[PDB]
Design a protein around this ligand. Structure first.
Ligand SMILES: *[C@@H]1O[C@H](CO[C@@H]2O[C@@H](C)[C@@H](O)[C@@H](O)[C@@H]2O)[C@@H](O[C@@H]2O[C@H](CO)[C@@H](O[C@@H]3O[C@H](CO[C@H]4O[C@H](CO)[C@@H](O)[C@H](O)[C@@H]4O)[C@@H](O)[C@H](O[C@H]4O[C@H](CO)[C@@H](O)[C@H](O)[C@@H]4O)[C@@H]3O)[C@H](O)[C@H]2NC(C)=O)[C@H](O)[C@H]1NC(C)=O
Ligand SMILES: *[C@@H]1O[C@H](CO[C@@H]2O[C@@H](C)[C@@H](O)[C@@H](O)[C@@H]2O)[C@@H](O[C@@H]2O[C@H](CO)[C@@H](O[C@@H]3O[C@H](CO[C@H]4O[C@H](CO)[C@@H](O)[C@H](O)[C@@H]4O)[C@@H](O)[C@H](O[C@H]4O[C@H](CO)[C@@H](O)[C@H](O)[C@@H]4O)[C@@H]3O)[C@H](O)[C@H]2NC(C)=O)[C@H](O)[C@H]1NC(C)=O
Ligand SMILES: *[C@@H]1O[C@H](CO)[C@@H](O[C@@H]2O[C@H](CO)[C@@H](O[C@@H]3O[C@H](CO[C@H]4O[C@H](CO)[C@@H](O)[C@H](O)[C@@H]4O)[C@@H](O)[C@H](O[C@H]4O[C@H](CO)[C@@H](O)[C@H](O)[C@@H]4O)[C@@H]3O)[C@H](O)[C@H]2NC(C)=O)[C@H](O)[C@H]1NC(C)=O
Ligand SMILES: *[C@@H]1O[C@H](CO[C@@H]2O[C@@H](C)[C@@H](O)[C@@H](O)[C@@H]2O)[C@@H](O[C@@H]2O[C@H](CO)[C@@H](O[C@@H]3O[C@H](CO)[C@@H](O)[C@H](O)[C@@H]3O)[C@H](O)[C@H]2NC(C)=O)[C@H](O)[C@H]1NC(C)=O
Ligand SMILES: *[C@@H]1O[C@H](CO)[C@@H](O[C@@H]2O[C@H](CO)[C@@H](O[C@@H]3O[C@H](CO)[C@@H](O)[C@H](O)[C@@H]3O)[C@H](O)[C@H]2NC(C)=O)[C@H](O)[C@H]1NC(C)=O
Ligand SMILES: *[C@@H]1O[C@H](CO)[C@@H](O[C@@H]2O[C@H](CO)[C@@H](O)[C@H](O)[C@H]2NC(C)=O)[C@H](O)[C@H]1NC(C)=O
Ligand code: NAG
Ligand code: ZN
Ligand code: ZN
Length: 447
């Protein structure tokens, strides 16, 4: 989850992730671009406020008080500079001086042209294969992070798109308690709490940025999939888009789509939760996808209706106590999908975003795996569009986003786990077009 420049014995020992930008006088002579005023290495700011009693294991999980278990000094950039070493720009800015505004448009995937749809499919496939230039992934927890001999960092290179899968897996994985003990599962740093919407917003922002740089196309944008059509087929599952059903196995993607060639990461939970290891970059197994196929669970055999979206946008409070998956009259919990679209909680209901996952009846409907199916990207740009329309309609009212006593990882000033550089829920809780450099070309139904 860290810059490869920081995945070193020296850096892990010093507790400092403050890499050079333009060091002319040797290594360490331009940390954070301080030579040119772009930033300085400074102490980390991390949330110290209480969380709900759902998690009883403080001191046991590296994700706690992110990123203090790994680094307590980081680059603090000035002005509109940003990034791990202050070498890029805050959202909405670009250029070598971070003084050119940028506004990218995220469109309905079905409204793209033939060339644009093809360009997008090729861009995903390229991200699946291209090594992430900056980030490497830990394969062991902190105590074993330097390997058996104490001098070999347990990090791996990983592709741009598998990194997108990995951070998701790491935010939802169980707390490892010890060999021979059951791993603890009532923890999730990106779901079942107020941070669900802002965590997934940054997730997309980061992938869109990495894909722009991979392509060297600064205006590249992620499209969305309007899944609220009431249909019981997947209208983007075609061989020019995200792949039709295989005629040889109804749970695999058609061999006429490159997405039948993808192999998935992080599907060895039994190993991680018993051995105490983490998902690594070795791929194993194809995408499973069987839209409408869950005959044993008929409620998840049809997608949400248009009116379900219109109703969830009538829910006025962003979130409500206990800020969890049983919150009632909470917009966050409604659109996440643990309440029906009017806001009323019911333990048996799956709606909206949750329902769209389960409709896929495959890789895309399992929490630790779901980004492996690239429909995830489009399902979440649409979810992010609902969120952005809510922020417009209710003046980005953050007042019900709790400052304390949220489930762990979901307090307002928590650094969302495991994003780098550190970034809070508050930074994503702004209307996108004015503040984050992107906007949705979309229309909202009535009633
Ligand atoms: C920011 O991180 C700094 C680097 O630490 C690493 O990275 C962070 C992110 C974590 O992952 C951490 O686990 C990593 O170690 C960190 O600097 C380190 O801080 C410790 C504690 O202050 C320094 O310890 C000092 O060292 C010597 C001896 O080293 C060990 O000895 C004693 C045994 O007696 C241990 O208890 C210590 O923890 C040391 O590990 C001692 O001179 C001294 O310990 C004595 O005094 C203190 C205070 O009275 C007592 O707690 C002890 O019991 C001892 O009586 C110091 O504690 C460690 O050397 C230092 N490393 C470096 C490279 O500087 C820093 O604390 C972090 N800052 C913040 C604000 O979080
Ligand atoms: C929203 O969900 C909340 C979290 O729910 C979790 O996940 C779901 C799926 C359920 O399974 C749920 O039970 C899980 O916890 C939920 O909060 C939970 O609410 C329940 C019911 O009020 C609480 O259980 C009761 O808690 C007390 C307190 O326990 C603590 O303190 C005592 C004293 O220090 C210690 O002994 C405990 O170990 C804990 O430290 C218990 O006293 C009590 O036991 C009594 O009842 C049981 C019958 O079940 C008898 O066996 C006992 O003898 C006692 O008579 C209960 O266990 C639970 O703590 C709480 N969990 C958390 C994490 O907050 C919340 O209610 C939901 N909200 C709504 C509106 O539905
Ligand atoms: C990247 O991550 C992947 C995914 O975790 C790792 O690959 C897996 O590694 C695990 C752990 O080593 C492997 O799981 C083990 O497989 C063994 C071989 O299985 C034979 O015997 C079992 C009986 O249990 C049969 O079901 C099976 O068909 C074979 O005949 C088993 O021996 C293991 O169980 C035994 O060992 C463990 C200790 O590991 C004991 O606790 C158990 O009680 C038991 O005795 C275990 O199931 C797994 O097969 C690997 N998967 C793949 C796809 O390769 C990579 O290693 C990892 N890479 C890096 C570099 O970290
Ligand atoms: C990630 O992979 C790189 C190599 O891959 C290259 O860099 C990536 C960041 C991407 O751009 C890839 O597409 C690209 O191919 C590994 O870097 C390599 O590390 C090794 C081991 O430390 C280096 O070997 C050394 O080489 C010299 C001889 O050349 C000797 O002095 C040393 O004894 C030692 O053997 C190697 O030079 C280095 N670079 C390259 C280009 O191969 C990197 O380790 C890896 N990171 C992780 C965390 O696995
Ligand atoms: C995709 O949909 C299929 C088909 O609906 C799902 O398979 C079904 O999974 C359920 C839950 O595990 C199975 O129910 C179980 O059945 C037996 C008794 O027969 C018992 O062990 C349990 O008590 C439980 O009720 C169900 O049998 C099974 N159906 C089939 C045809 O295998 C599948 O889980 C879905 N996959 C994903 C990833 O969503
Ligand atoms: C960095 O970007 C911010 C906006 O993200 C700039 O601030 C705006 O600048 C215009 C033009 O001067 C003002 O009219 C706005 O009122 C400003 N908004 C805010 C929120 O300050 C800022 O000037 C840019 N440059 C820096 C910080 O050097
Ligand atoms: C929905 O799919 C079912 C099987 O899942 C199929 O029988 C049916 O024709 C589809 N749609 C409608 C509108 O009945
Ligand atoms: Zn998710
Ligand atoms: Zn999701």
């Amino acid at each position: 989850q860290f810059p490869r420049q920081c995945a070193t014995v020296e850096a892990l020992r010093s507790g400092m992730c403050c890499p050079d930008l333009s060091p002319v006088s040797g290594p360490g002579t331009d940390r954070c671009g301080s030579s040119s005023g772009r930033g300085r290495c400074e102490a980390v700011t991390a949330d110290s406020r209480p969380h709900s009693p759902q998690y009883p294991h403080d001191g046991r999980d590296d994700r706690e008080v992110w990123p203090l278990r790994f680094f307590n000094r980081t680059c603090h950039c000035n002005g509109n500079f940003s990034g791990h070493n202050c070498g890029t720009c805050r959202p909405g800015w670009r250029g070598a001086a971070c003084d050119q505004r940028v506004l990218i448009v995220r469109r309905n995937l079905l409204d793209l042209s033939k060339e644009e749809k093809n360009h997008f499919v090729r861009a995903l496939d390229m991200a699946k294969r291209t090594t992430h230039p900056l980030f490497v992934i830990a394969t062991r927890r902190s105590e074993e992070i330097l390997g058996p001999d104490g001098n070999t960092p347990q990090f791996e290179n990983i592709s741009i798109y598998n990194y997108f899968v990995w951070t998701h897996y790491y935010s939802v994985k169980k707390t490892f308690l010890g060999v021979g003990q059951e791993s603890f599962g009532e923890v999730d740093f990106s779901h079942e709490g107020p941070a669900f919407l802002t965590w997934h917003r940054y997730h997309l922002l980061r992938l869109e940025k990495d894909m722009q740089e991979m392509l060297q196309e600064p205006s590249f944008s992620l499209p969305y999939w309007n899944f609220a059509t009431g249909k019981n087929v997947c209208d983007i599952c075609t061989d020019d888009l995200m792949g039709s059903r295989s005629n040889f196995d109804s749970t695999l993607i058609s061999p006429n789509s490159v997405f039948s060639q993808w192999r998935v990461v992080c599907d060895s939970l039994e190993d991680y939760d018993t051995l105490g290891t983490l998902c690594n970059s070795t791929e194993d197994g194809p995408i499973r996808r069987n839209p409408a196929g869950n005959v044993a669970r008929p409620m998840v055999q049809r997608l949400p209706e248009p009116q379900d979206v219109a109703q969830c946008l009538e829910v006025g409070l962003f979130d409500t106590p206990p800020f969890y998956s049983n919150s009632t009259n909470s917009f966050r919990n409604t659109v996440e999908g643990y309440s029906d679209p009017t806001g009323k909680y019911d333990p048996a209901v799956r709606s909206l975003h949750n329902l769209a996952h389960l409709f896929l009846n495959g890789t895309g409907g399992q929490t630790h795996l779901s980004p492996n199916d690239p429909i995830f990207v489009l399902l979440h740009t649409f979810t992010d569009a609902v969120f952005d329309e809510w922020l417009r309609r209710y003046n980005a009212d953050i007042s019900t986003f709790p400052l304390e006593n949220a489930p762990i990882g979901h307090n307002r000033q928590y650094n969302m786990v495991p994003f780098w550089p550190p970034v809070t829920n508050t930074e994503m809780f702004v209307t996108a077009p004015d503040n984050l450099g992107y906007t949705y070309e979309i229309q909202w139904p009535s009633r």
